[PDB]
Design a protein around this ligand. Sequence first.
Ligand SMILES: C#CCN(Cc1ccc(N)cc1)C(=O)NCC(=O)OCC
Length: 165
Amino acid sequence: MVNPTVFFDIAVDGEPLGRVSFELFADKVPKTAENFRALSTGEKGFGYKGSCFHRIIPGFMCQGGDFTRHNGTGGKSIYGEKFEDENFILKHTGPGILSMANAGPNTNGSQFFICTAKTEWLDGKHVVFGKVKEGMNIVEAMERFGSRNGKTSKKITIADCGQLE
Ligand SMILES: C#CCN(Cc1ccc(N)cc1)C(=O)NCC(=O)OCC
């Protein structure tokens, strides 16, 4: 019944930066939380380890999770290539919100974003499923490698990831 916690160890051109951990709201969005959790442990045989943050826009969000094409055009969920929008109970209330990227209704895969500002205009369009627990400072450090158009100035990778006890 306690919401799960997952971590990401972040590197910058291969050099360790720090760890960000996330509370996944499995009490409110279990299907979506489970997908992110499993992708984070790699227990299905695929997932986030080694993948990059391909789009980082300071004052907006950091986006990653495209472990098949590395640029925002790929990824897949543990349920198939895509899955439905589970619900929109949770809103984009400020920095640290963890939400699913998508390409239209009912097109969730593996891509996600971490907000670094309130993004209210995404409410009811993107499924919010977690929040940063520890290491928002590390998110803020990653954010400084982004740009207005989202292209990063150094390669930002998930060097390791998994589930915390
Ligand atoms: C290019 C590209 C990637 N992409 C389209 C996309 C997203 C998720 C999945 N599974 C497939 C395509 C998107 O990034 N779409 C907009 C979005 O979700 O922004 C969140 C702030």
